């Protein structure tokens, strides 16, 4: 409704709370699959839904428009095999049209768009057999579909926020020479791995006096003063989208952050 | 001032072996093995080994309109041994063949494929050492020192706007360095220092970072990257960060 209330955004629900809701929903007549082994493409009216499917790890294509949507459908069908996708839509003229050429792959879910994000997922999980696990806090980037998520202890991203956002925002900076670099370097050295799921941050720099400070974790690294993150699987890094993290996220205790190695979006478990 | 960041980093020998997590990309090695080239005249390019993945390597090159090069150890000609991180040599390269599958799978982190490692000559070995002296590597990232001759008559500035889903309201300049490479800079960081003809009364010096491209340009100054204004009167001061 134009005047109806907004639902709680999936981004605000802790994964364990969402895991408890969804773990009890499955279609027992279908073979169970891990989320990343389920390939989906959403009709153009279900983009937000598709992003929520990505949150729990489903592989989802989000078309930019109807033409883009149809091109994908033709290409998926040409390639076939492992690359065939479930087509999710709602009862509509689009669904009627899709059935003419994609009946065997199209699923129309009634009222999917007049329905809360959690209820949307329940509808999907009732149709499929998804094997989810408590440890998968952020398996996939909701914005670009990438699985290449670099997991950092919160202090690393706090460091990044203070250097790239706060320092130049609070007083005029002719340069970065006044940032307390050594203070933050020493704090990085004393991150307790026991507080962040056993993730040990390895700090390195070319010389004791160099500003080229790198924080390395098993899934990649972050070049703090270059605002550049690099997933271990990739040859090229990405500018971290750090200006978009609310300042208050860094007051949360023992919080880990995920930096997407392909688009730079920063994510974390909901409060 | 190349500064303390250049100590122990100049060249290409400080490139760490970074693990490839295979279960995140279980079909990656098959694509690399199966990938083909477009059938045109191969072009020479100076390439540096920046990643190694069981029987394959990804190479960086400053050649225009090339965003990384795949090296297939089993298909490339001219190889005496398996490539090593930081190796620099000239290769003949071709664009990879675009397939329908490309739209349906992970992002492909290279545009070209090496077809042959050119034998080294006394002249090329001089160009290779020159290149090594002009870059610096650490923590898995390559940087290159460049000068933008904004104070000279030749136009070396171009505006680039990318309406991609996530970078719609980000605007950049493409800057052409004296050595011929293109680099990006956020427009708002330089706009107020240019005249109406996109020149200025200073030259811009900076170590630029190699990372994922804006358009076809993969070298970047960034919002806070150290950059220096060399004024025609001799003064040198830092370009304020954005
Ligand atoms: Zn992403």
Author numbering:
A (entry chain A): 628 to 898
B (entry chain B): 326 to 567
Q: What do the authors report?
A:
The MUT-7 family of 3′–5′ exoribonucleases is evolutionarily conserved across the animal kingdom and plays essential roles in small RNA production in the germline. Most MUT-7 homologues carry a C-terminal domain of unknown function named MUT7-C appended to the exoribonuclease domain. Caenorhabditis elegans MUT-7 contains a specific insertion within MUT7-C, which allows binding to MUT-8 and, consequently, MUT-7 recruitment to germ granules. In addition, in C. elegans and human MUT-7, the MUT7-C domain contributes to RNA binding and is thereby crucial for ribonuclease activity.
Further trimming of a few external amino acids on the CTDs of MUT-7 and MUT-8 yielded diffracting crystals with one copy of the complex in the asymmetric unit. Structural analysis using Foldseek revealed that both subdomains show similarity to oligonucleotide/oligosaccharide-binding (OB)-folds flanked by additional secondary structure elements. MUT-8 Asp330, in turn, interacts with MUT-7 Lys838, which is further stabilized by the interaction with MUT-8 Asp328 and Glu551. Next to MUT-7 Arg853, Thr855 forms a hydrogen bond to MUT-8 Arg536. In humans, the insertion is mainly disordered, but in C. elegans (and other Caenorhabditis species), it forms a four-stranded β-sheet (aa 784–868). The surface of the β-sheet participates in MUT-8 binding and mutations in this region (R853E, T855E) abolish complex formation. Interestingly, the zinc finger does not seem to be directly involved in RNA binding but rather in coordinating the CTD-N and the CTD-C parts of the MUT7-C domain. The interaction between MUT-8 and MUT-7 is mediated by the two folded CTDs forming a tight complex. Mutations in the MUT7-C β-sheet prevent MUT-8 binding and result in RNAi resistance.
